[PDB]
Each structure stands twice: as C-alpha cells, then as structure tokens.
Amino acid sequence: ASRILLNNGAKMPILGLGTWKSPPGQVTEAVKVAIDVGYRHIDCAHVYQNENEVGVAIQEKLREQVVKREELFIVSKLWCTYHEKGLVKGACQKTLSDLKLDYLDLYLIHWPTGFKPGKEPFPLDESGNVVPSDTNILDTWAAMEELVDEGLVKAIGISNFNHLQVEMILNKPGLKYKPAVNQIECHPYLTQEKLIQYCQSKGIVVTAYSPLGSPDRPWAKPEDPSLLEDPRIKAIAAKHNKTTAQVLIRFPMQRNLVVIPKSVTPERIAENFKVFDFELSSQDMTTLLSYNRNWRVCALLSCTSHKDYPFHEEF
Numbered sequence: 001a002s003r004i005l006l007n008n009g010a011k012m013p014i015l016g017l018g019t020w021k022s023p024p025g026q027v028t029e030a031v032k033v034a035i036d037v038g039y040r041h042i043d044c045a046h047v048y049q050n051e052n053e054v055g056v057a058i059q060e061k062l063r064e065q066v067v068k069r070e071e072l073f074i075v076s077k078l079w080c081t082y083h084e085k086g087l088v089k090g091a092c093q094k095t096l097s098d099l100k101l102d103y104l105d106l107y108l109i110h111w112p113t114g115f116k117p118g119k120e121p122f123p124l125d126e127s128g129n130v131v132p133s134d135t136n137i138l139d140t141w142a143a144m145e146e147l148v149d150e151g152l153v154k155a156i157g158i159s160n161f162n163h164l165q166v167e168m169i170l171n172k173p174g175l176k177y178k179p180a181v182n183q184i185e186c187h188p189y190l191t192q193e194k195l196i197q198y199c200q201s202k203g204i205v206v207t208a209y210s211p212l213g214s215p216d217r218p219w220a221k222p223e224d225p226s227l228l229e230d231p232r233i234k235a236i237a238a239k240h241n242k243t244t245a246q247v248l249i250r251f252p253m254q255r256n257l258v259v260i261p262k263s264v265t266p267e268r269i270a271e272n273f274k275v276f277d278f279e280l281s282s283q284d285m286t287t288l289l290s291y292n293r294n295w296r297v298c299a300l301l302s303c304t305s306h307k308d309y310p311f312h313e314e315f
C-alpha cells in the first residue's frame with residue numbers, strides 16, 4: 001500500500017525523495033527522474049537552498065503531462081530563524097514562490113529551536129553557541145495553523161520534536177489543528193521505539209529521515225558507524241537479492257512509517273523505489289531493531305544549551 005492516511009483526510013505516499021545536500025547543479029534532474037519512476041513525495045526545506053531547482057523539475061513534468069499537481073505530495077519546513085509569528089507566513093510564501101507552487105501538502109516546523117532572526121541561518125556567538133530567539137513552540141504552532149486556515153498548506157506538522165514537545169502542542173488550549181506528522185531521524189542505529197510508539201498512539205504519522213545513515217552529512221567522522229557498509233545488513237540484503245539501501249528503505253515501511261531516502265544519482269533513485277516487491281521477515285525486522293545504538297546523525301552540540309533543544313529527553 002503506497003500511501004498512509006493523515007488526520008486531515010489526505011493520503012501521504014510512504015516513500016518520498018529527500019533533497020538535503022542535492023546540489024542545485026543536480027537536483028532538478030534528480031527530481032525529474034524520481035517523478036518518472038514513480039515518486040510522488042518530495043521532501044524539501046528552505047534551508048536546503050535548492051527549492052527553486054526542485055520547482056523547476058516539478059513545473060516541467062507538469063508541463064510534459066507526466067503528473068498532475070494533485071498527484072504530488074510536496075513537503076517543506078519552516079527554518080529556525082523564522083519562528084516569530086510575524087515571519088511565518090512570509091517564510092512559507094518564499095518557499096512556495098521558489099517551488100512555483102500555490103500550496104504545500106505538508107509544512108513542518110523544521111526544528112523546535114528558534115534562532116535569532118536574520119539572514120544568517122545559523123547565528124552563533126563565540127563559543128559555538130547558537131543565538132536563540134525569544135520564541136516558543138506554542139506560538140509558532142499557532143502561526144502554522146493560520147497557514148492552513150489561509151489555504152497555503154493542506155496539513156502542518158513538526159520535525160525533531162521529542163514526546164513532551166509534541167504533548168505541549170496536543171495540550172495547547174485553543175488548538176486548531178493537531179500535528180499530522182512528526183519527521184524524525186530513524187534507522188537501525190536509532191530505532192526510536194518509544195517516540196514512534198508515542199506518536200502512533202496519538203494518530204500522528206512518523207516520517208523517518210536519514211534512513212541510510214546520511215553518509216554525505218558534512219560533519220561525518222571516519223570513526224562513526226556506517227549503516228550502508230554494515231556487514232550484518234549486507235548479509236540481510238544478499239539473502240533477499242536486494243541492496244543494503246533497499247533493505248534500509250523497506251525497514252521503516254514495515255513499521256508503518258513514511259521514509260524519505262535522498263539521492264541525486266539516477267541509478268540509485270530508481271533502485272531506491274524498487275522496494276514494494278519484497279518483504280523483510282520477522283527475524284530480519286527484530287535483527288535490524290536490535291542494532292539500535294541511539295546514534296544520531298542530526299544533533300548539534302552548538303544547540304545543546306537552547307531551551308527547546310530536543311534530545312536531552314529520553315524520547
């Protein structure tokens with residue numbers, strides 16, 4: 001089954017294309033190829049500074065009569081320097097204009113941490129400390145709600161929120177919209193059982209990012225664990241006559257998660273979609289879950305003093 005039901009009545013494709021680190025030089029072709037081999041879900045963000053070129057590819061394929069807009073599920077995220085109430089609509093409209101779209105299917109608060117407003121996406125002081133803003137999760141949420149009520153986005157959600165921060169929103173007096181999605185890091189080294197359990201028990205759909213371990217993350221150390229090269233996972237792949245990436249993509253799919261693997265390589269975009277023709281076994285699933293090391297690709301020491309830093313909490 002290709003799509004999962006959101007609490008706003010819309011259906012979200014469970015496999016989408018990630019675009020973080022897809023060079024503007026190469027992401028238009030990536031998205032074009034993706035659409036051609038069946039992707040309908042693209043995960044974007046303003047901070048990825050490639051939304052224009054993503055938009056280029058979508059516009060063309062609409063022009064080519066390959067897909068219709070209603071068939072596409074486009075996601076973007078509000079960046080941290082835009083959490084102020086008065087900045088949210090603008091930030092959304094910039095993303096929309098960049099993507100050459102009239103609406104987004106899903107708009108996420110990218111991180112719970114508000115940063116000092118300005119051009120700089122990551123304002124720092126002088127001990128690697130991020131300069132926060134005097135914003136909070138509740139007021140930002142209300143600003144997102146307004147986006148729905150003005151037709152700019154069909155659904156809103158969060159990303160990198162811990163369970164207490166999700167609770168804050170759920171329990172907000174005067175809540176208009178429940179978050180539809182919480183997009184978090186998830187893979188066999190960070191299996192997220194308690195947070196998934198929590199969100200799923202709230203009717204909030206979970207999207208797994210960095211499902212392949214983000215080998216191209218710009219802060220990688222050669223000593224860090226490498227999922228795509230893990231022998232134990234290669235072994236599971238070979239018994240299924242699939243690649244390790246295919247296994248890493250299929251795994252969250254069988255946990256009722258959405259997954260959004262990134263590639264700019266045409267061969268890999270096509271391969272990564274070919275995951276609806278095999279099933280991981282019960283023994284495979286518990287084996288992969290047992291690799292959890294609580295290891296994060298995405299966690300900034302420069303943010304660990306921010307009041308809304310998400311990862312002090314167990315989950």
Ligand SMILES: NC(=O)c1ccc[n+]([C@@H]2O[C@H](COP(=O)([O-])OP(=O)(O)OC[C@H]3O[C@@H](n4cnc5c(N)ncnc54)[C@H](OP(=O)(O)O)[C@@H]3O)[C@@H](O)[C@H]2O)c1
Nearest residue numbers: 018019020209210211212213214216245261262263264265
């Ligand atoms: N909400 C947030 O905070 C957040 C944070 C991180 C990521 N995300 C989203 O999640 C997406 C996925 O995560 P990610 O970009 O961190 O990393 P990922 O999807 O785990 O890994 C992408 C890396 O894997 C390589 N790769 C892809 N398919 C492969 C295959 N079949 N075989 C071997 N290598 C393969 C890619 O290389 P090539 O591209 O060179 O082929 C790229 O270097 C992002 O792009 C973004 O959309 C969201």
Ligand SMILES: O=C(O)COc1cc(Cl)ccc1C(=O)NCc1cccc([N+](=O)[O-])c1
Nearest residue numbers: 020047048080111113298299300303309310
């Ligand atoms: O966030 C992503 O989607 C991918 O990671 C990116 C991508 C781009 Cl273009 C620029 C910067 C980052 C990054 O350092 N994200 C991590 C991060 C951010 C904010 C707070 C935190 N935090 O831990 O509080 C972590």
